[PDB]
Amino acid sequence: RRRVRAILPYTKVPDTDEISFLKGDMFIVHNELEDGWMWVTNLRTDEQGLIVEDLVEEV
Amino acid sequence: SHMRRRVRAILPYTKVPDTDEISFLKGDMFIVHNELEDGWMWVTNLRTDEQGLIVEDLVEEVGR
């Protein structure tokens, strides 16, 4: 249960469970998943969803 | 296509031994990482955090 930060923005793939975000957004990681993905909650939008792991860094 | 979606088990499943299928309980949720051309998919079970193969016939999309 750690916080990670977006280093770049991301626009979700339509009709999927991915979420869009902005550089600087903070997320709480719920599941690491396979390398390359993460199941998280974006603290700014309060949205739970799938994100691309290479766009976030440890804080 | 269930790619990049969260899906939920509609029935339990016990893996075939010596395969990389994963056993799961009804209600378990998963994130789909790869969809193979036979209905099977590489996923992560959100409860156990294990990666493995599950078949699409046993799950339904539930959204975020």
Swiss-Prot record, chain A:
Q: What is this protein called?
A: Ras GTPase-activating protein 1
Function recorded in the entry: Inhibitory regulator of the Ras-cyclic AMP pathway. Stimulates the GTPase of normal but not oncogenic Ras p21; this stimulation may be further increased in the presence of NCK1.
Per the UniProt record, which residue ranges are transmembrane?
Answer: none
Expressed, tissue-wise, as follows:
In placental villi, detected only in the trophoblast layer (cytotrophoblast and syncytiotrophoblast). Not detected in stromal, endothelial or Hofbauer cells (at protein level).
The linked condition is: Mutations in the SH2 domain of RASA seem to be oncogenic and cause basal cell carcinomas. Capillary malformation-arteriovenous malformation 1: A disorder characterized by atypical capillary malformations that are multiple, small, round to oval in shape and pinkish red in color. These capillary malformations are associated with either arteriovenous malformation, arteriovenous fistula, or Parkes Weber syndrome. CMAVM1 inheritance is autosomal dominant.
PTM comment: the record says:
The N-terminus is blocked.
* Sequence ranges assigned to domain SH3 in this UniProt record: 1-59
Q: Which residues of the full protein are shown?
A: 281 to 339 of 1047
Compartments in which it is found: Cytoplasm
The annotated subunit structure for this chain is: Interacts with SQSTM1. Interacts with SPSB1; the interaction does not promote degradation. Interacts with CAV2 (tyrosine phosphorylated form). Directly interacts with NCK1. Interacts with PDGFRB (tyrosine phosphorylated). Interacts (via SH2 domain) with the 'Tyr-9' phosphorylated form of PDPK1. Interacts with tyrosine-phosphorylated EPHB4.
